[PDB]
Scaffold this active site. Structure first.
Site: not given
Ligand SMILES: Cn1ccc2c(=O)n(CC3(O)CCN(C(=O)[C@@H]4CCN(Cc5ccc(-c6cncnc6)s5)C[C@H]4c4ccccc4)CC3)cnc21
Length: 327
Positions: A13, A246
């Site tokens: 992440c 994202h």
């Protein structure tokens, strides 16, 4: 651009975003490089891997991988990145480093950059009794809900809260009392790391933030010679939900307002607008910001030769890469 990305290897992440942010904290990069990994565990020493990643960030003609770092500090579960806040990871790294620099020429660097100081106080209304405790911070978490911009945050943050009725203050010898508890900044670090409290299920509310951020007025004393005006340096961004998230960081690594988009392996030039207003939110928006104090800008962002790396180090990493010879 000339700058190189980081690999997407799993679900790191935000890590990659944080890594760039830090790698472009030039004064910290030099400092990291100096750290003595001469006799360190090539595999499990974090301070080593942060040298490797930075090395490769400065030298790789290909996108830099992070597996070895993720191993060095051991967030290797199915949720070990999404179960933690971002300053938590920062602290992990910045700890391992700040230590390794102890008893060195480069001791005291992490705080010199990222540490500032504060006072939390409690003052009784009617009676005479005060509780003033100073703390060091390395990063600040602002409440965005109900806040339209960064200003309203810092004003919310220093809001003198009231303690009455069902939650009066246990003043001890004076018994339960009506009093007001707040906070107040004494200093702010050269590097000001801010997280916007979007986790609660992600809030996507519009939250404005400036390129230039004056902070003198939230201080208790001000400095005529040194005002507290800040230069937006990075903008950590996320978009999505508990299904598809994202992570991306926008940087203007030189404080010159020439922005770049860092989407992991792919790094591109982008507009000021793309970096700033387009991440105000209102779903793809800022969650953490980095800000350098204007005065210290040139130093923090001092340029970095390849001659700011010790040979000893340089040699080790190369052998290690060369020996990366597979059949
Ligand atoms: C104290 N506090 C309060 C909020 C907050 C905060 O937002 N931050 C910034 C933050 O640390 C939030 C968490 N974080 C994440 O990346 C989140 C991690 C959570 N993720 C959602 C999930 C995806 C998958 C999940 C999951 C859960 N359980 C098992 N498998 C997957 S949960 C959504 C992500 C998110 C990104 C930007 C803003 C807000 C949240 C890093 C950024 C830091 N401190 C905060």
């Amino acid at each position: 651009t000339g700058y190189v990305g980081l690999k997407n290897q799993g679900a790191t992440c935000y890590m990659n975003s944080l890594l760039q942010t830090l790698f472009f904290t030039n004064q910290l990069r030099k400092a990291v490089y100096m750290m003595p990994t001469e006799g360190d565990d090539s595999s499990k020493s974090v301070p080593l891997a942060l040298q490797r990643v930075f090395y490769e960030l400065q030298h790789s003609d290909k996108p830099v991988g992070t597996k070895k770092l993720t191993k060095s500090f051991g967030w290797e579960t199915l949720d070990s990145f999404m179960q933690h806040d971002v300053q938590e990871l920062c602290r992990v790294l910045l700890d391992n480093v700040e230590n390794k620099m102890k008893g060195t020429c480069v001791e005291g660097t992490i705080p010199k950059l990222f540490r500032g100081k504060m006072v939390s106080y409690i003052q009784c209304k009617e009676v005479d009794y005060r509780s003033d405790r100073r703390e060091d911070y390395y990063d600040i978490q602002l409440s965005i809900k109900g806040k339209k911009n960064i200003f309203e945050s810092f004003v919310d943050y220093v809001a003198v809260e009231q303690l009455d009725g069902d939650n009066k203050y246990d003043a001890g010898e004076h018994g339960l009392q009506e009093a007001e508890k707040g906070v107040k900044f004494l200093t702010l670090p050269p590097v000001l790391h801010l997280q916007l409290m979007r986790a609660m299920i992600k809030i996507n509310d519009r939250f404005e933030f400036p390129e230039q951020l004056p902070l003198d007025e939230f201080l208790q004393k001000t400095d005529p010679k040194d005002p507290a005006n800040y230069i937006l340096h990075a903008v950590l961004v996320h978009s999505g939900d508990n299904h598809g998230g994202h992570y991306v960081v926008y940087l203007n690594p030189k404080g010159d307002g020439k922005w770049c988009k860092f989407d992991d392996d792919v790094v591109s030039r982008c507009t000021k607008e793309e970096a700033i207003e387009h991440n105000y939110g209102g779903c793809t928006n800022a969650y953490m910001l980095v800000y350098i104090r204007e005065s210290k800008l040139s130093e923090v962002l001092q340029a970095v030769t390849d001659h700011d790396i010790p040979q000893q180090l340089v040699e080790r990493l190369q052998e290690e890469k060369r020996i990366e010879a597979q059949k």
